[PDB]
Amino acid sequence: AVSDAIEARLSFAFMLNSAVQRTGERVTAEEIRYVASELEDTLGGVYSILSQELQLPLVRVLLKQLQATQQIPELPKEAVEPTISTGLEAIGRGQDLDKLERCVTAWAALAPMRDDPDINLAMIKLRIANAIGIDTSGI
Amino acid sequence: EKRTGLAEDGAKSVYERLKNDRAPYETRAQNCAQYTIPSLFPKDSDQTPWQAVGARGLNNLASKLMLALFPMQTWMRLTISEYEAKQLLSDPDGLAKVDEGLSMVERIIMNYIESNSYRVTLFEALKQLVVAGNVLLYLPEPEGSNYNPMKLYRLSSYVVQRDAFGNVLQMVTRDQIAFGALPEDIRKAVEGQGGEKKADETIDVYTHIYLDEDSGEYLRYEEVEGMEVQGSDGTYPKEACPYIPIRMVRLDGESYGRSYIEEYLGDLRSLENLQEAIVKMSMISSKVIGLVNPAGITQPRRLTKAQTGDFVTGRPEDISFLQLEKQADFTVAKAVSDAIEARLSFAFMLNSAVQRTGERVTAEEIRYVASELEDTLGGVYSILSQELQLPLVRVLLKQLQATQQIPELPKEAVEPTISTGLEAIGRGQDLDKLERCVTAWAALAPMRDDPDINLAMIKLRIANAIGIDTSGI
Amino acid sequence: PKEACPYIPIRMVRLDGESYGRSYIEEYLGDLRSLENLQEAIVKMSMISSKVIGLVNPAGITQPRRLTKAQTGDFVTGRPEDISFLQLEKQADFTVAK
Amino acid sequence: QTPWQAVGARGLNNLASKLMLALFPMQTWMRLTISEYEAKQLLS
Amino acid sequence: PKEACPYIPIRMVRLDGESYGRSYIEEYLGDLRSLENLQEAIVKMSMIS
Amino acid sequence: PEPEGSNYNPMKLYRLSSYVVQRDAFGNVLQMVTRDQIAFGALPEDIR
């Protein structure tokens, strides 16, 4: 019993998906999702640390190493010292994409008044995008 | 020049005097770390723990806070200053310009934070911020566009003093650089003051900062062996000091802060003290020891040699195995251990405190007891937003305008307001009140074709009580 | 001015006719001490339960030295009647207090 | 000499595996974007 | 050049004011030894059984 | 190492025991001394 009590505690600290595996009770579905979002919470911890400690320095060195051996076909001055994004940004499923179709879905909220009696949909469709935080340049 | 005022008697002399009202606060931090991760605050002056509970709790607490305060997302939102926003009324072409560039500084601050590896030290800061009362952050001048990291001083190797209103009066750090690493200016000055030094001798390097009674600003200087350092003098303005000392739990009328783990320390020690005896008990239980009666026929030699399947000269009355049979008292101790370990799991925002092996846990209690972890976390978050998030942004803004990495903008955006929290994620109360008001205009769709109802005045009062701007609706 | 003093003294529980206020935890203090006084004896009890202590009968053949030295799997000169472990067996009274 | 348990073994291995597939996938996991100072230059 | 050295030394757990970093497993080492020290006696017991 | 053309330029990894580091106050790298343990029959002819 003591060994299994410890082995469970460790299984959490090694992001083992089989720490939910408690042979004690009829494990529900609503705790599985919640105790799994504690494994994601402590993993997002080490990931956002190693992004700074090992991911970005590795890219930053390869960038300057490959521009120096001219395998990088030259580009207009604006892109020789850029900004290096990583994480959910680079997978393509980042906060930017979130805020846009979180704003598209707020313009379907004023569909039961697209035919607006003096409501003025023009300023609202702009303030909605203001609070969210898009660019609004040319919308 | 001999300096007086606060640094009248040197630097190291102030460090050792203020080390006396700080000594209780590091002893407290020492105890809390001994039961979590000792490496964060070793018990060296004024070995691992038997349990990993506090260990996984401390790490999970910091992780949840670091991912809350400092995400990959933009987590600050600059917006036009009120006094200079009333000036630009009804001018949306020259007003969108001021907010757009404000949202450019929104990004510049991030890129500086990303590429300079601020996050990785902020984590080690939050870990320290929780088990120890305080941390000291130093972010030097940008100095070009290089790799300008952040420096972190743990409580034991720095010292602070505050006034009545809680403002910083003086701060004396204390690096412990090895001689073979000091700058050549300081290095030759050291062995040239008496005694040549080896390459591994450790040199105490202090760093006084203090307000000047005459000026309205801070004066600093490095200091080695009792004599001031070459080229180390300098001044910082009072409103933008790049040395930030952060407290966790305030106690208005005190130089330092209280730690977070401190408040639940009594139970945390009860668990470690128990887990020790429990594990030690488990080792005794799994220890197999025979007991051959010497007045008997069975000889101990023949048994240890015997293979499986062997028959052996002896009777079963002579041998017996050492039974511990403390099964009863173990269940008592293990039940208390689990009861305490659970109480702490709530105080460490462990999502696995719902994990009660007692009953068929429903779906409707999980949501409610999870909204107590959200309720006690929003506590420390909205505190650290003021104690560590807002001061950090406020310093980098004035630090980056001073090295003109901020492309200039129209006067309205030189002193704006710095919003944080759910505002900057973009899912704040503003967006809430807007589509909570749109959804009140779809409620009068079964009378859009209104017989004399007048939808114009109603569609306006709805937005009034809610609290939108109503400017041009 | 009387209408805008920047020193504010706040009470929790008013008692009109008194300078200070009553605390909120005060009203439930009696149970709060009952719990602490109990948890003390409870926690202390678990420590005695998990304390393993042998009891070698000196008039017996089994000597305490040989046992502490022995490895796991070793057989040892002795009888099981000589050794016993200090049982607390307050399982009944524990469940009451808990 | 080897350990009596494979707990840390599979734990350590699972820790590395999850991190490498998070940090370094077959996917493109960095995103370069225009520097801010030289992006305001190329406006409109 | 200082800005692009191709030798990169990485730390795991920072402790600002030290050349090297702390390991991740170090923080939970006590329980990891409790388990192994136990698993030995358990496995050894099963062989005796 | 440097790309050195477009060849097979792998990555070298030094474990903690066969390398050593020193840093300053702000945490920047001061010096690094590695330590391979190559067998004589493998060294380049210059060093050999």
Numbering used by the authors:
A (entry chain D): 343 to 481
B (entry chain C): 3 to 48, 55 to 481
C (entry chain B): 245 to 342
D (entry chain D): 55 to 98
E (entry chain D): 245 to 293
F (entry chain D): 148 to 195
Question: What did the original publication write about this model?
Answer:
The bacteriophage portal protein (also named connector) is found at a unique vertex of the viral capsid and is essential for procapsid assembly, genome encapsidation, tail assembly and genome ejection. Its overall architecture corresponds to a ring-like hollow cylindrical dodecamer. However, portals have also been described to be able to assemble as undecameric or tridecameric complexes after overexpression, although they are only incorporated into the procapsids as dodecamers. The portal protein of the T7 bacteriophage is coded by the gp8 gene and has a predicted molecular weight of 59 kDa, which would give a multimeric complex of 650–770 kDa, depending on its oligomerization state.
Nevertheless, self-rotation function (SRF) calculations performed with MOLREP indicated that the T7 portal was composed of 13 protomers in the data set 1 crystal. Comparing the peaks at χ = 30°, χ = 27.7° and χ = 25.7°, which would correspond to the presence of dodecameric, tridecameric or tetradecameric NCS, respectively, the highest peak was found to be in the χ = 27.7° section. Therefore, the complex present in the crystal was a tri­decamer, with one ring per asymmetric unit and with a solvent content of 49%. Eventually, the 3D classification of a subset of 1200 particles with RELION yielded a map of a tridecameric portal at 7.8 Å resolution. Built as polyalanine chains, the model consisted of nine α-helices. It contained 194 residues of the total of 536 amino acids present in the gp8 monomer. The resulting tridecameric partial model was used for MR with Phaser against data set 1. The model was then subjected to rigid-body refinement by protomer using REFMAC5, which moved all of the protomers significantly (3.5 Å) towards the central channel, shrinking the particle diameter and central channel. Solvent flattening, histogram matching and NCS averaging were applied with masks generated from the cryo-EM map. The correlation between NCS-related regions of the map was 0.849. This DM procedure yielded a fully interpretable electron-density map of the particle.
